[PDB]
Paper text:
The mature HIV-1 capsid is composed of the capsid (CA) protein arranged in a conical lattice of hexamers and pentamers. CA assembles into a conical lattice formed by roughly 200 CA hexamers and exactly twelve CA pentamers, the latter of which facilitate lattice curvature and closure around the viral genome. Monomeric CA consists of two folded domains connected by a flexible linker: The N-terminal domain (NTD) faces the outer surface of the capsid, where it stabilizes the hexamer, while the C-terminal domain (CTD) forms dimeric interactions that link hexamers together.
We therefore devised a lattice assembly scheme in which purified wild-type HIV-1 CA-6xHis is anchored to highly curved ~30-nm small unilamellar vesicle (SUV) scaffolds doped with nickel-chelated lipids. To determine whether SUV-templated CA lattice is comparable to that of CLPs and authentic capsids, we determined the structures of SUV-templated CA lattice in the presence of IP6 at pH 6.2 and at pH 7.4 by SPA. The estimated resolutions for the global pentamer structures were 3.3 Å and 3.1 Å, respectively. The global pentamer structures are virtually indistinguishable between CLP and SUV-templated lattice preparations. Although our CLP assembly scheme recapitulates the morphology and composition of authentic capsids, it only works at low-pH (pH 6.0 to 6.2) conditions.
Numbering used by the authors:
A (entry chain A), B (entry chain D): 12 to 85, 96 to 220
C (entry chain C), D (entry chain C), E (entry chain C): 1 to 85, 96 to 222
The structure:
């Protein structure tokens, strides 16, 4: 067994602190927590200072997923709470991972954490995408960058996102860009839209 | 035996001096001092520059724990001071950990440090959980953040913490949010409560 | 009541003087609240018709209540004689005005027993229910929670008035479901409505604890 | 109850009318305070399931409380049948709705006795505990000592509310240790904090006598 | 209690349900006034240790009072075992936790009788005295006659507080002699002092009748 690096822990704390709960924190967490035990994941979650409302929401999501795991599955076999790391121990976790075939308790807990963090990101998105409107002289590149950051935050359905990018993206634009976008018409990819709408 | 890394030592000193004494200091210490000998733990504690009142408190609590160990427990078997590393050598400390069987001299001293840090954090918390109260205009998100930071610093049993989580969060809210939370009723979850009290 | 002899024969047991005094205190001090009927049911456990008549002699002091109690007993006796035209108990015999004590004891010891005492007790309870319905100080629609009254006190008053009114069971269910919320004070009424329809009384009381 | 005959045979003893009237007074006048459960335990000493059902007929007047009492009795009967699949007492037999009185008497006189009465009493006490938890006028966090209230009255109110709330034993211990000091008025709270943690209630009451 | 059989054998008599309910009312409604101990002595006449434990189950609802009552019973049991190292009653046997009912009945019917019930009653009374000493709302030095209070009411309050405090007999005599005069209002205090020292309470009350 290898411990998580202090550099990795500091990186996780720093990215969480600076970015709050922007959508990129999920891929950053998945990158930093590769091959991590439930003990390591619990350590990384505990070391986060601030946003304790979000961390409690994550705890409640973990508890709900553990209850679902226990309902689906009524040495000692790993229960849902055992996978969560609250009741298990490091030796048990490593044994479960080393078993052939393995019980990837780390990946299950990571998936639960990812679900909780997606819910946190959706809750913490600053404004709804309907309110993302271009300014009178804001660049179209800046406005569409903001629009797509917000759209990534919402995590709406695929069809809903398609409709949004097709219709609301041009609807919320200022008249100067809006006229050009309607001239391009429906079916235009984003590349074509803003490469024709530049300047 | 490995020497404690300068990067790890600087990280511990920086987190202590920057966060003063917050609840995250306990898991940060547990993560940094993984597989640490009593000499390494003493190095980590002594290297801290400021908060010398808190370090004296931690020394006092370590002394009390060593006295309790001496009372309960009348390669030589180590005494409390021997566990604390005040009257033991590095070779003797690696003894009882490489021994067959090994008694975890490092983990016992780490546990004592954890108890002392728990007391330090409990008192360094600004207000008690019962005294945490939402302001007339405070948003529910920041009120919840303060509440759960204080609960993390509360230093009570887990059942009592669960009761606090279910009751005091609703009880301490301002009437504007208290009415909405009562309409939600018991059985709600923090996501639903925060979405309801967003306004 | 009825008590077995030392040799197994069942013989009449006279109602104790302090039991009668307790019934007198219930009749005189309680002012015909809804709780007189539970207390009448408790004090008259196993009572024969003669004992029941002895108890009714105490409520005989009130002229109107005694009159309606007697008329209701007569009506139920007429119904009994209509359905039921030792000897068979007649309507007046159940009341204990024409029969004799040994006859009542024999009826109560039949195999299967003839529950004459329970029948007369039920008729008396019907009459007492009517008397309680008269003496209710307010109707259910006039019960309103005060601005500062706790919801527990308002619920207790509401259900006491509901017991006094004695409407139909479906009407009673509708009343407890809807009129309880309607008559609550606005701050409590908001939470009651927010709970939604079909909420159990436990949910309403837990949600509204300390709101007043 | 159960009473021995003159020749040694154990036979059912009917619950006295004034005992039932006392239970009725507890149910009707006390408004489901925490003290109803001690009084129910006292009045139902040695009671059989039939006697317990007779007592429950009086609290049957309140619809909500009766409903939850019946549902809790049903739940505990289901648990009993789960663990326990003359004849063996079934869940409905313990309640006294399907069994017969002689069967209950025989169960209570077994060697060793089958404590059917105590079991049904415990189920009823669970239901009454739930009913008391509903009717509590305030939660424990809302009990606060007044500026002039003596600490004895505040402690009595606090422990009454604690009995009404019925939290976990560890949570209850934490509450009496901490929340009692927290909710005390400032002049009394100063002495409570100065006493330090772990102080017994006797120390708190003796130190705070006359402070208010 | 204990009751003789029809053939002369002494057998255990169960404590009546309404006696237990009376004890429950004393425990719950009286708030541990000094009068609970006379009432406990009255209600527990002839009680066996099992009956006493049944009565203590009702005061078990209060955690602190039950804890000190149990610890005082344990202390007196330890003293009994120290002085006293069928079979001899042990300390736990007097409490009725280890012994059996027939053993207690046999002890109470010995020639001369072994007063186990009175011993356990005395231990319980010691514990109740301690509990009453805690719950006293004011100390004896804080009892002061009001400007308009009659001397009879002030004397009654003073002696109630004296019973609650339970000081030494010599200290109690000094208190009733001196502190009663000291705390009286000035117009009554003048007459009390003019009566001189050693005046009986009858003289003080007769002289001060109507002064307030």
């Amino acid at each position: 067994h290898q411990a998580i690096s202090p550099r990795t822990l500091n990186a996780w704390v720093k990215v969480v602190e600076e970015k709050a709960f922007s959508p990129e924190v999920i891929p950053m967490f998945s990158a930093l927590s590769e091959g991590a035990t439930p003990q390591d994941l619990n350590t990384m979650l505990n070391t986060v200072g601030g946003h304790q409302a979000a961390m409690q929401m994550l705890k409640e999501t973990i508890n709900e997923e553990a209850a679902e795991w226990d309902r689906l599955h009524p040495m000692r076999e790993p229960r849902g709470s055992d996978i969560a790391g609250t009741t298990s121990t490091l030796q048990e976790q490593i044994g479960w991972m080393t078993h052939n075939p393995p019980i990837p308790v780390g990946e299950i807990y990571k998936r639960w954490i990812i679900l909780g963090l997606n819910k946190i990101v959706r809750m913490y998105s600053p404004t709804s995408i309907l309110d993302i409107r271009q300014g009178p002289k804001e660049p179209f590149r800046d406005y569409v960058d903001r629009f797509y950051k917000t759209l990534r935050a919402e995590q709406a359905s695929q069809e809903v996102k398609n409709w949004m990018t097709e219709t609301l993206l041009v609807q919320n634009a200022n008249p100067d860009c809006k006229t050009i976008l309607k001239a391009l018409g429906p079916g235009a990819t984003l590349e074509e839209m803003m490469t024709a709408c530049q300047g």
